[PDB]
Design a protein around this ligand. Sequence first.
Ligand code: M7G
Ligand code: NAG
Length: 246
Amino acid sequence: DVSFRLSGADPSSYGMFIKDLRNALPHTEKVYNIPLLLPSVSGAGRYLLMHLFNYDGNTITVAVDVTNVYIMGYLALTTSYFFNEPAADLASQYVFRSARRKITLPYSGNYERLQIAAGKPREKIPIGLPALDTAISTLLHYDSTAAAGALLVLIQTTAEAARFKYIEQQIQERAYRDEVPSSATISLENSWSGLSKQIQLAQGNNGVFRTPTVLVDSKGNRVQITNVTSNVVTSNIQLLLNTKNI
Ligand SMILES: C[n+]1cn([C@@H]2O[C@H](COP(=O)(O)OP(=O)(O)O)[C@@H](O)[C@H]2O)c2nc(N)[nH]c(=O)c21
Ligand SMILES: *[C@@H]1O[C@H](CO)[C@@H](O)[C@H](O)[C@H]1NC(C)=O
């Protein structure tokens, strides 16, 4: 399991949690020095449990698929909540079985679905460590509209940060003040599957992407990523979704 406490959290302790999260995901291979997530894992071992504590010390446990860093569901006191999707229903067979009751949330884990439930795109939702404290608090008591926004915060501040060092840095900058994600942050989240695929296809193509990935940069400019020498590949990306899952 991995854990993160909001009480006394700073850029350093958050960085430790994101390091722990990445290190908890198994890999047998690196591709261009980036860990390659497994094609699949059997049984309960497919799921990592993240123990998150809000500032008051209340806690949720979040179940994450170790093959793709997808959040499947979470446990809050004696109630489990899972996304309305086959993968999460499958997860519910393995985690939080001791919950007194299981609620299936009225949406899948998809960004598009979550944003419609929440009533806003994530361009408009501040993120940061204070937002993560709120999100844990919200998830503690069922409210499906509020939970969509909380889950948008949770997914980006955990999974997306694990995936991209840039996104981790954006959250560290937001340790004590929330701010909507940069255009670059949104771009990277949206491109993780694409990047993961092209980095793996580069392996037999002399480091060259079969298809260029379009991203927005730090100054908010649209750039073409064509090969593994790009900073996105050498510095930024920390985990590759296996092409078997693309
Ligand atoms: C497509 N899929 C992607 N996610 C992740 O949760 C958010 C998925 O939403 P998305 O809109 O599919 O993401 P993307 O367009 O950025 O790939 C991203 O972090 C995805 O990595 C997903 N999470 C769950 N729980 N279930 C899914 O089927 C699923
Ligand atoms: C590789 O990418 C760099 C910029 O990241 C660029 O200068 C170069 O033209 C690219 N090479 C190819 C063959 O795509």
